[PDB]
A = this chain, B = another copy of it.
Amino acid sequence: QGKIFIARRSLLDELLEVDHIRTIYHMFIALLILFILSTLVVDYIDEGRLVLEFSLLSYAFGKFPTVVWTWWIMFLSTFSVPYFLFQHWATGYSKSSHPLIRSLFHGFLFMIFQIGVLGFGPTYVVLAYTLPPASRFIIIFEQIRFVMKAHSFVRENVPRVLNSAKEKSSTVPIPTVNQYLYFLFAPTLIYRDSYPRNPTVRWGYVAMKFAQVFGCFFYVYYIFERLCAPLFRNIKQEPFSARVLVLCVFNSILPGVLILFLTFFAFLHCWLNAFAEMLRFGDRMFYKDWWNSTSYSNYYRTWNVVVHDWLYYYAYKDFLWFFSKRFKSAAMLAVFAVSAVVHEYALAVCLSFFYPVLFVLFMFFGMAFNFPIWNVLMWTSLFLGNGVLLCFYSQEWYARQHCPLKDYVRPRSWTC
Contact = CB atoms under 8 A, between A and B. Distances in A.
Interface of A: 15, 19-23, 26-27, 29-31, 33-34, 38, 41-42, 45-46, 226, 241-243, 246-247, 250, 253-254, 289, 291-292, 372, 375-377, 379-380, 383-384
A33 B291 contact: no
Given A31-B383, A33-B376, A246 B21 contact: no
B292 A23 contact: yes
Given A31-B383, A34-B380, A379-B30, A45 B243 contact: yes
A38 B250 contact: yes
Contacts of A19: 289, 292
A288 to B, nearest CB: 12
A38 B20 CA distance: 31
A246 B41 CA distance: 8
Contacts of A254: 254
A20 B376 CA distance: 13
Contacts of A241: 45
Nearest to A44: B242
A45 B246 contact: yes
Contacts of A21: 20
A227 to B, nearest CB: 10
Contacts of A289: 19-20
A352 B23 CA distance: 37
B20 A383 contact: no
A331 B8 CA distance: 51
Contact of A246 (B23, B42, B243): B42
9 contacts: A15-B20, A23-B379, A26-B379, A31-B379, A31-B380, A31-B383, A34-B380, A42-B246, A254-B254
A28 to B, nearest CB: 9
A243 B46 contact: yes
A220 to B, nearest CB: 18
Contacts of A27: 291, 379
Contacts of A15: 20
A31 B384 CA distance: 10
A390 to B, nearest CB: 15
A29 B226 CA distance: 26
